[PDB]
Design a binder for this molecule. Structure first.
Ligand SMILES: [Mg+2]
Length: 203
C-alpha cells in the first residue's frame, strides 16, 4: 500500500487497554504494516516489541496464535507463521508497542487485527535469540534472513516502516535503500547493537 494518516487514525482509535509495563529482560523492536479490506491501497506502520515470556493474555484474542522456531526450539505469540531458524528455547510475546518511556518502561496496547504475517520479522528475531542478552536495542529491525542465517534479504513496505520507526524517534535498520542504517548481515547488525547506535565520527 501507501501511507494513510486517515487509515492510521481510524484503526488506532480502535486500540484499547494500553498498559505501562516494566522493562523486559531483553527484547527487540520490529515494524508491521496494517491494512484493511475496505481501504485498498492504504497502509500505515506501527511497532512491535518482542519480549521473553508467554503472555497471550496481553494480546487481542485475534493475535493469540502461537508460532514456533525451527525444530521445537522456542515459540512466539502474536506471530502467524513459523520461524525458519532455531530460537533459544524460550517462548516470546510480540506486543504492539505504543510507547517506550524514558525510564525504560514500555507502553503496549491491544490491537484489533490478525497476527504478524510474513518474513520481515526475521532479522529482529534472529538477533533476539542469538545476539541480544540484555535490554532492548533502541532501533527498529526489518529484513528476511537467508538460508545461511547471516545474509539479510530485502523486504516490502520499507517506506511505511521507516515512517513508523521515525514516529518513535528511532532509526530503521535493514539491508536496503529506504533504511536509515545499513547492515548486510547479522554480524554487522550485532556490532550495531553493542554500539547502541551507528558509531559516530564527530571528528
Ligand atoms: Mg538449546
Amino acid at each position: 500500500g501507501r501511507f494513510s494518516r486517515n487509515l492510521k487514525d481510524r484503526l488506532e482509535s480502535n486500540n484499547y487497554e494500553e498498559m505501562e509495563l516494566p522493562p523486559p529482560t531483553k527484547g527487540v523492536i520490529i515494524p508491521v504494516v496494517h491494512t484493511v479490506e475496505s481501504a485498498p491501497g492504504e497502509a500505515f506502520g506501527s511497532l512491535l516489541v518482542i519480549i521473553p515470556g508467554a503472555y497471550p493474555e496481553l494480546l487481542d484474542p485475534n493475535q493469540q496464535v502461537l508460532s514456533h522456531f525451527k525444530n521445537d526450539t522456542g515459540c512466539v505469540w502474536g506471530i502467524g507463521e513459523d520461524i525458519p531458524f532455531e530460537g533459544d528455547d524460550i517462548c516470546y510475546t510480540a506486543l504492539p508497542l505504543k510507547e517506550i518511556k524514558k525510564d525504560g518502561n514500555i507502553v503496549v496496547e491491544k490491537v484489533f487485527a490478525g497476527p504478524a504475517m510474513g518474513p520481515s520479522c526475521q532479522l529482529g528475531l534472529s538477533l533476539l535469540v542469538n545476539d541480544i542478552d540484555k535490554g532492548v536495542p533502541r532501533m527498529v529491525f526489518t529484513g528476511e534472513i537467508a538460508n545461511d542465517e547471516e545474509t539479510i534479504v530485502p523486504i516490502c513496505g520499507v517506506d511505511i516502516k521507516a515512517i513508523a520507526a521515525h514516529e518513535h524517534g528511532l532509526p530503521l535498520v535493514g539491508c536496503q535503500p529506504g533504511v536509515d542504517e545499513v547492515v548486510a548481515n547479522t554480524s554487522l547488525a550485532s556490532h550495531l547493537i553493542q554500539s547502541g547506535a551507528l558509531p559516530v565520527q564527530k571528528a
